Amino acid sequence: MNTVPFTSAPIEVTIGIDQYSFNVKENQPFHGIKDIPIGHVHVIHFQHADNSSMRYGYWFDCRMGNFYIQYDPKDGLYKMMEERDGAKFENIVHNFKERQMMVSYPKIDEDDTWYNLTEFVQMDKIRKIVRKDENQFSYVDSSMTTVQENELSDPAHSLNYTVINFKSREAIRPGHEMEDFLDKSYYLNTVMLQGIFKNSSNYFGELQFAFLNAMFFGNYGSSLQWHAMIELICSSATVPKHMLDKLDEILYYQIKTLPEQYSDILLNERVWNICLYSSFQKNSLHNTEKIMENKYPELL
Amino acid sequence: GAMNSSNYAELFNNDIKLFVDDTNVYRVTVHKTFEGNVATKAINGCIFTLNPKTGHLFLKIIHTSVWAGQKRLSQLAKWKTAEEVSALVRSLPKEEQPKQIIVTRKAMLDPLEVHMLDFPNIAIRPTELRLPFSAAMSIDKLSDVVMKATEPQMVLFNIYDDWLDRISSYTAFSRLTLLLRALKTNEESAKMILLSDPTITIKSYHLWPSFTDEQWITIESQMRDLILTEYGRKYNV
């Protein structure tokens, strides 16, 4: 179990650690988060009390380094940094734990929620979507745009998700226009899976990461990416059976975790009605369709 | 974006454009089977591709063999239309290709956009106008060439005959749409109006009779009456 210490908490802020959050008051004696489960990526994330504008945060994996948070009063945000001096870090954490100045990552033993939301998400893929190679952790916020969004303006600060565009030469084989547009199996299986992602695990990892950025940071382009990746599978007649069963599980836990009051902004009525009720895979997502009907029947 | 009454004069500027109407591509008669079920029998159809400025009519005849062994024919008909329009554009030299294609039904947008991905600089547009191009098969010579076809075929006509020698393309298009609206609302009456006088003939190489300017005014007036008449016959007004 690893630790992310904080130098201090000089401004009042809501701090999220994955699906959990806690409020910290201005200059409250808060020195970080302990008992973080090893084996998964994590995201620490922030919303300032004075300006709920720009939810922001950091994706990290404690196996890759010792990370801490320190407020920067010039740039006005909580920044993640890496500590390279291993004995300094250990001695900082031990003192903060001894004075009980840290909150505990509050996971229930029965509860696989975070694993189920991050099963295919790896730090190394995150760092190719979020390019800042001098750090082992990745910053994301509410306003960052995606490469595809920019084609339709700062490249260094972009989310480099894989571009998916159903009316594009990549998606449509010359002479298979109707076939490929009405059945996207070619684009899913050959272009994207075999060609770009190499396997379904990498595809699911990007889908899961897009959902988590959409939910945690209200990142609109991430939400577009999540729905496009769902729609590309649902609109394919030919999908490996293990991928459909895994997709149903992935989406099930995303919809289950999703707060009820954010559904209006995070869920696209057209994609979900198409996917559950008209698409080739309308009968393949039993768990997702049952939770969607019982939790968001208005949307449908 | 969409083509409507506000930007109607754009049709007669010097940017090449085409209207595409797919109403008459997939045509059927519905009948009873010996067992008393219902079935369809396709008949030849046509794509109506029109340059509104010049009157160029590219009539691609759709022979019933193109449907043989195919399913979901009303959906296929839109993609077949888009394939044939795309093939037409590609055959043309660059300077002669359209800068916009206006489809008369919105269900043609995605099929045509997908077939024209190779032409990102050609705009595919819908329209809010209710254009009466479905009535093209009420023009006797167009109907004749479609029904006689034994194979796929492209037939070329000027839908304005020689009118542009005397009138502008705005006026010619307005005449065309009035004639077609009339044929669509009451085909028998409309055709009675157009041929009533045996001394006014249709030249072999024309579609419509050789009216003088003054006789076209009478004709055009008689067509307005018909459309209003039918509007009363229809609504009891």
Ligand SMILES: COc1cc(CCO)ccc1O
């Ligand atoms: C902790 O922060 C958040 C948690 C959730 C998931 C609650 O199941 C959604 C949005 C958030 O900002």
Ligand SMILES: COc1cc(CCO)ccc1O
């Ligand atoms: C020159 O007159 C015409 C030319 C064409 C071919 C234009 O690609 C079609 C119809 C016509 O009346």
